């Protein structure tokens, strides 16, 4: 294969929409902008995700709800990410949050919890918490749950 034989697939490198370059293109003169008003101006138009012409916006008329927090900010408390019995069949022997972190199943600095969606394997499973369902399937499929602190 030569260098000149290197090309992309069709559609891999579409050309761009050049506006303002004349009549026969389709985007001459007003460059698809229409006639006058805002929007047609350079820089024009307030953020249309938010702005509604001056009336109170659909967003701002909805009420606030919940704890927002206050200075000095959020409170540091233990946090848990759960992992299911299905997300364990890939292993053998023992399971610990350290090995679950390498796998791409648990996120670092999060305590481990086992949840019950899926088949239970006879595994020795160290974790920080178990759901009732995850305990029953586990302590009744041959495996050893290790609750820890």
């Amino acid at each position: 294969m030569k260098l000149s034989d290197l090309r992309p697939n069709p559609g891999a490198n579409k050309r761009r929409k050049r506006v303002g370059r004349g009549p026969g293109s389709g985007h001459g003169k007003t460059a698809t902008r229409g006639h006058k008003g805002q929007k047609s101006r350079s820089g024009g138009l307030k953020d249309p995700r938010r702005f509604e012409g001056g009336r109170s916006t659909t967003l701002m008329r909805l009420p606030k709800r919940g704890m927002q927090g206050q200075v000095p900010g959020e409170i540091k408390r233990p946090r848990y990410q759960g992992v299911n019995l299905k997300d364990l069949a890939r292993f053998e022997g023992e399971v610990t949050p350290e090995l679950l972190v390498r796998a791409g199943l648990l996120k670092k600095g999060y305590r481990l919890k086992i949840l019950g969606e899926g088949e239970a394997k006879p595994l020795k499973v160290v974790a920080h918490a178990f759901s009732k369902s995850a305990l029953e399937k586990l302590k009744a499929a041959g495996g050893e749950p290790v609750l820890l602190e």
């Binding site: 294969m1 260098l3 992309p8 697939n9």
Partner: protein
């Protein structure tokens, strides 16, 4: 498994080698684009109406002269003024996915294998750092000079020798890249280089 021909001091033997079965011509294009793009210097530049050396005086009053309205002479509508969307210094590099380029490196070598253009050598005889010395070896090796060759070897003497012939690109194996594999018609390597090559594509 392709059958790569090995040149030897003790006989033309062969050696089974596991290279990708089918080549993805779009992938080799994606690797070469990125190689040739991250090397771009990105030093085109122009000046904006604010970066241009004239002062901001209003040249004449807004109304009543009978001429057009203008501001300062730095506006791009003036000759000698700024340029509107001229190039600025750019970084064209981007992180092509590792697994992609690792694949392209195997697929590029595979194509030359699937062509009888890949040739592995154990050593280079009377060649110790002289271009004549390599020239002789290339004659005994079939490599007359009628075809471009990628010379991949961690022997600097061998590299020094050939690197000046117009039909030879020389490379340390750590430099093996698909662009140079495509650039060239043939491809010659050390078993020291083949050994490394196998390391990288895993």
């Amino acid at each position: 498994v392709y059958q790569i021909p090995v040149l030897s001091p003790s006989g033309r033997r062969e050696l089974a080698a596991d290279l990708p079965a089918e080549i993805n011509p779009h992938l080799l294009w994606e690797v070469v684009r990125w190689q040739l793009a991250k090397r771009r210097r990105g030093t085109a530049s122009t000046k904006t109406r604010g970066e241009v050396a004239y002062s901001g005086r209003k040249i004449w009053p807004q109304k009543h002269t009978g001429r057009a309205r203008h501001g300062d002479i730095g506006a791009p509508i003036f000759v000698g003024g700024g340029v509107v969307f001229g190039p600025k210094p750019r970084d064209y590099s981007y992180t092509l996915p590792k697994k992609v380029r690792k694949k392209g490196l195997a697929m590029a070598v595979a194509d030359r294998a699937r062509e009888g253009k890949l040739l592995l050598v154990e050593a280079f005889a009377g060649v110790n750092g002289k271009t004549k010395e390599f020239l002789a070896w290339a004659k005994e090796a079939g490599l007359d000079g009628s075809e471009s060759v990628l010379l991949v070897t961690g022997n600097e003497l061998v590299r020094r020798a050939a690197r000046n012939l117009p039909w030879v690109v020389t490379l340390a194996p750590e430099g093996l890249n698909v662009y140079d594999i495509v650039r060239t018609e043939r491809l010659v390597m050390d078993l020291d280089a083949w050994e490394v090559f196998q390391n990288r594509i895993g």
